[PDB]
Write a protein that binds this DNA or RNA. Sequence first.
RNA 1: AAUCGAGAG
DNA 2: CATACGCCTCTCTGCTTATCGGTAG
DNA 3: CTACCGATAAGCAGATCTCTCGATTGCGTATG
Lengths: 156, 148, 59, 173, 63, 229, 101, 753
Amino acid sequence: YQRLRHMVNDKFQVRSTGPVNSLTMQPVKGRKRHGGIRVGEMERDALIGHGTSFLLQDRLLNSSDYTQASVCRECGSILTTQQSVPRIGSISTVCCRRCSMRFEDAKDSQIWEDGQGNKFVGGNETTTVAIPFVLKYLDSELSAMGIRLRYNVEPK
Amino acid sequence: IVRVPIALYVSLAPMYLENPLQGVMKQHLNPLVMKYNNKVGGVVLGYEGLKILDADPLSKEDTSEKLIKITPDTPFGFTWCHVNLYVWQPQVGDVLEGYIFIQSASHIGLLIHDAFNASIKKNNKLRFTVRNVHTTGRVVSVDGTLIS
Amino acid sequence: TATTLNTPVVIHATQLPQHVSTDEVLQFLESFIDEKENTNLSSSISQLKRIQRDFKGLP
Amino acid sequence: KQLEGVHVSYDNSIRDADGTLVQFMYGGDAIDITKESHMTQFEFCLDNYYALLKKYNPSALIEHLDVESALKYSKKTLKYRKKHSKEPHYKQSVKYDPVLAKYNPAKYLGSVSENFQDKLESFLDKNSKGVNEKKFRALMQLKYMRSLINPGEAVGIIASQSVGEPSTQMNVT
Amino acid sequence: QGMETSTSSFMKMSYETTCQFLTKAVLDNEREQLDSPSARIVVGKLNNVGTGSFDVLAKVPNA
Amino acid sequence: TGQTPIVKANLYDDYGMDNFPNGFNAVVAVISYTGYDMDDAMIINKSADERGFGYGTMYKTEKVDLALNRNRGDPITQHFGFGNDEWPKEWLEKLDEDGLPYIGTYVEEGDPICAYFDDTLNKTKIKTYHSSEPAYIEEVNLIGDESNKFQELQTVSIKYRIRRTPQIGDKFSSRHGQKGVCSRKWPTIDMPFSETGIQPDIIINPHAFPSRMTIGMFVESLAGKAGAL
Amino acid sequence: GPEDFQQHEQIRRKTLKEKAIPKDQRATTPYMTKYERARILGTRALQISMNAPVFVDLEGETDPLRIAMKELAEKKIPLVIRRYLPDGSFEDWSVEELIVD
Amino acid sequence: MDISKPVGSEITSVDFGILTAKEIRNLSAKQITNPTVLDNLGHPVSGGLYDLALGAFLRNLCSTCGLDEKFCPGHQGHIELPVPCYNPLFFNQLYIYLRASCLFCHHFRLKSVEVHRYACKLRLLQYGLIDESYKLDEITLSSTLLNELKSKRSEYVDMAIAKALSDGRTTERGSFTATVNDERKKLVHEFHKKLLSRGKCDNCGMFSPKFRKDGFTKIFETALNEKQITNNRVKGSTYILSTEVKNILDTVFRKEQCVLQYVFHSRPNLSRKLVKADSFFMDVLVVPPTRFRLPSKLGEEVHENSQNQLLSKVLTTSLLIRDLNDDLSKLQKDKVSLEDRRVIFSRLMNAFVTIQNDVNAFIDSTKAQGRVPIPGVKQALEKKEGLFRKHMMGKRVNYAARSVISPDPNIETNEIGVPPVFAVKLTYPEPVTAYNIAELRQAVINGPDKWPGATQIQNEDGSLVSLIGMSVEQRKALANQLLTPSSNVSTHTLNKKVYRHIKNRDVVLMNRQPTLHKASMMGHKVRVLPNEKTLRLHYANTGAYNADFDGDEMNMHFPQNENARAEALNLANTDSQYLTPTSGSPVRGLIQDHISAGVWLTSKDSFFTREQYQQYIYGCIRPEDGHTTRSKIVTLPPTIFKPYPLWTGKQIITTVLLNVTPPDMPGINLISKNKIKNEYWGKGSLENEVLFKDGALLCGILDKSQYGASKYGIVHSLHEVYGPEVAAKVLSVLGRLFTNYITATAFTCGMDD
RNA sequence: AAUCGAGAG
DNA sequence: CATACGCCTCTCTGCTTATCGGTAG
DNA sequence: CTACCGATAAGCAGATCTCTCGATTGCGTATG
Ligand SMILES: [Mg+2]
Ligand SMILES: [Zn+2]
Ligand SMILES: [Zn+2]
Ligand SMILES: [Zn+2]
């Protein structure tokens, strides 16, 4: 009898949380890096056939790259937003860039300033949604190609 | 002092599923009282006529039982609601009656309306005009200008 | 702070504001704490006792 | 990838997620593949009638239903087809349609397929034994009512898997 | 070729030749309606097949 | 511990493969007794496993070359050892006086491997073991250069040792393609026994034979018993 | 400004009203299908887990899913399903209106 | 995701579009000036590709947002390239529209009557009217006649749309389906074919020059013909600049705005925005944030991002052409070195070619020229290893384990053997309540080592606390102060969550790749075992998973929300999938040794005394574990009374059924057969058929045919009569029965057989 | 991080 | 002789496209 | 007569589960 070299100490792996891929914010690949295991296209299709929808959403959104992003309700875009630099005692606010003009160009509180010092008044109408970070990455890669994606939010 | 009926889309806590009126008021209205809200601006004070909408289209009114729509991800439910804000509105150029709390040579430390902070700057009962309004600061406040 | 649990998603307005009369002032003064307390935010709702006396008597 | 959206609507018709309709009934009978295990096993059904009743409780599943119109129209159409006897399909009239087409198979008891009725009557021609034809018929019809694909079942995914997974074990081609 | 005439562009793009189906969707200004299961997975919306074919309410007891 | 095969081919001695025994002569019982071996699994004897059955270790080499920064005449910025800075004594408890570790030290995650006083940062820099497998050191080979010019020490090769005892889930295979993971260490009091008084150390199912059609395994069992007797 | 929001609100409310079924024309299955059963149980479980009010005695229970199953047995679940149709329409069947199995 | 931070808003749709050249300029937080990405001293360089305006970078506060690397989301910027570049995505559409256009009269080289016919057809198809678009061709029946045709066709189309909107066959958004999409694409394809076929322009009569192309970023035209010039004169391989093509297209698109609005809008255009032909030309590029262009340290080696490489190359060519323009003005005043001026003008032309090809490389790697090639944006999301398939359809997931599988016939068939090492690592956030503090305080006390235990405690404000490096008394204080009123007003509806270990209460997902069918991914109630680090699986599931124990391993996903728990427990759990929807045949059942032991225990030759019978029944059943129904084990009369009480194996099966089967329910009166012919048992044997009755076995033998991969068996009928749950419990009970039996009377094979 | 090589079901 | 900066060949479907003539203005 | 077109064999674009390890990474020439 031969004792083979496929021992169970070199095959088991478990992750609760840990490192994530920087550009997708999804679990890393591999065992020695303490990554995740891929639920692939075929597994997803199997999960659809059962009709277990929340299982599919948990194994493809909730526990992989669920992010509480911000999207401009007026603009309809995800990655054009930005936090406003606070003044003394102020509270930082989420505000749009595409839907905002310079307060300098147009001739109280609806004026926000970015870090460089410019003063804006404009698209202060951004909400928070629940999207995968791969959505933001895809949006960036499409915008770099000259394509815009308007996202319609249910409450407007 | 004006009344502004507004429609808001406020989330509901599962803990208040047996008292939705209080679950909306104590969760979205009290955090708005005495605060500069970007729809009126003055010290919000009063939440009269809070009416919870119903997600049932064929819902005759006056009913004491209402539907709340549940988000597919979390137990918290969302809905539309209607309520008259009933809020003050001081702005630029309005007569304001105030009092002086502590006199300072550089920035007078005074609480207008017996409760609301303010200050008097350098280059600037009594019915004084208003130049601007300070709401990005710690509290609701307004500086004093005495040019006429 | 100011997450979903303490912030309306949107406060879109339906109509223009309307004012009130003097007989709507002394109603709110005498019938608010009767309808509210007859918590921790109470440190920020005490100023109504100051607002009531402004329109009622001497601060 | 293409069938991954098609799913039974709450009208018992199957239609892709864009709304377009592919079929009005799954296979023409709305019979669930898992649940059709012993629909035609009438001998076993008769042998077990008394055990099957405790789950197909009529008195617990009769009130919130209509038990008359579907069976009446079923007998009407059954007699119609019997009377027309045998004639080529391009000659036969279409004055009477399958019952499930007009009557909801899940709200109207007795609204069942046509092969099911023919085989049920053929095996009820035994005339061998309590248990009577009326109770046996009512229980078989409640079995058919509980043997229907639920709406929203991922029928397209299920069919794609059923036609692909057996292909692993594979003069005209 | 057999899925060209489908309203869900995300299905085609995820399937294959993502570029060509992307051009055909941006040029016609097609508004992906987010109802095919693949589009839902792309955006992160609960799938409508099965336990997503309905909604859930909550009968409150008080006005 | 390896053993010569009783059922050996004639070419086991022409090629001289006695130098590398790859296994052992195990008492196999073709029996359906436990239920823990039906599809392809197999069962080892817990007592036999505890008497050294199929034990083995693993050896891992980890180069600790410290020339990761210096480059062709750039000054030696790091020297193995301990400087005149702050370093907790728990490091020395595991570390030798020169900064390299001892030999035969039990190492886990987070334990120092080798320390050195970094010149620029003015602080000793440790290195940690990267594996969730507790280990024992085997050697520490210092490395120089073959050029006539002499340098400092910057490369060391460490070999590690870990006890790879055969636990349930490990794959043992006959010489007839009858592979199968060990499914339970069956205690000898629960093992079947014979009149002679031996519990077989390996239990395999009979149902593996009909579909697989290996009469070679049966005849090897026969020949092995005959040869040992 | 304010009135355009009223126009949006009226349009959405009228469309919602026209989509629905007036509590008596609904002709869908009375049987609770497995998917509705599973999601009803899960949503009630989540609500209980976030400390939503419970009406039946726990019977020394710790699992919110078990408690929700007990509620479904007692049928004291304040929860309404809403079956959407191909074009889109509602049927707000409540808890004590469907027959299980 | 977290369950105590719900999101009020939600996406409801998404519509593609062209990113207008001026919105990015309004959007952009910084231009990109110089190619040099980084200087020395490890610092960013203003106007580079790592500006602080494009996002935080290695503890450099973002000059746009002001947050740090953990909170800056990135900020897009733009690079302004001087000469407009063809957008490589829409090159074929640009060619189609540029071709078949008459720059002379600035119209399509096609009859305006036919062009208006196609436009009216398309505006009808936008609302789903398919038959109307075909009956529009019934008006055919010169300027006055053509204008009459236009007026009548447009009036007819407006009336048709009015009728459709009034009746209800459409809404304001339009009616778009698969059939309408097919019709629209068919009509557009035929329209493009008809457009790119004509000769001289039919609206004026003038010929126009042809165009050509050597692929992408390669634009050329031609010269006229010896007879064509004569035709043109009586009617009245040159390179083409990108700006020239843009200027040609602008005019014709302004002229044909109607047809172009009905072509470039499959939905009725509510925004009534124009169709500007500059959309085909990228005047300004967008640079993704530093967040999406970060580098990584593979030890000491640091790799510059390939996107930064290609963008810096594009910017190098941009600075080349810009600084070459500075010296082109030097020869502007001195218009006497025109030959060298033409030399540097050819240099400017080649720089135009280079910059267009650089942007082509930056978008599509293959649309570059030159023979390792750097991936482009199209190549980054194109194929199996792209973005859609590798990161949106299927993603790596948290709270999911994996290990080799091993058999365990001592777990219920709806269970799985969870090793202790997973049970101390996989977790589940249980929000503390008054019905959980008994066990959640205990989990907190035990901490992250002693199962059952906890790893983190998530505070009411959403903050997290780790129990990994704490003492017993510290965790005792935390547990005793676990559930407490929250004095924070904002989080007045939230409670602590304990990241407790996976107990036996929960359910898990199991998946053995490849997942050929849906049954290969079910749900199992977890049972925690203090044995080796491997998953332990019952034997019946080997058929469903197609799984063996020759070294197989299968993923074990842990659902993290009650929605998924209830999903896997009711729709996907292994008991609710006794049969497969492929053909409605059974897929579960004991496999080999239980079957071969059944052929022996249910053999007619096997009798068992009182002690052996009772031992078998109790070991199989164990009423203390819920396998019974009468709160006390029941028995059977022995077959034989003298000389001493013996039983039979068939009686053993009968009482096993009687003990598992619910009471006050007739037993399965079953008639079937098995895989064993009568002549094998000898003359007069009737063992080929099994005769069940009232819950008793009376003839034949149990076999594979009655449990396993065979239909119409005893377990199949138990399924058909008591649902799948009782059939699952029968599978489990027979698994524990034929196992304890086969220990006593073992089964073997040898040379004698 | 890709490429190449060894393997597992 | 170290250090530093860029130039270079054994599948199948389904749509790019045919050369020429039929045949009414 | 010839343009409109309706149909005749060839060039190219894009196809053909999950996992764990280890090793290595193109060169030429110019200034000090
Ligand atoms: Mg295997
Ligand atoms: Zn905006
Ligand atoms: Zn920033
Ligand atoms: Zn022209």
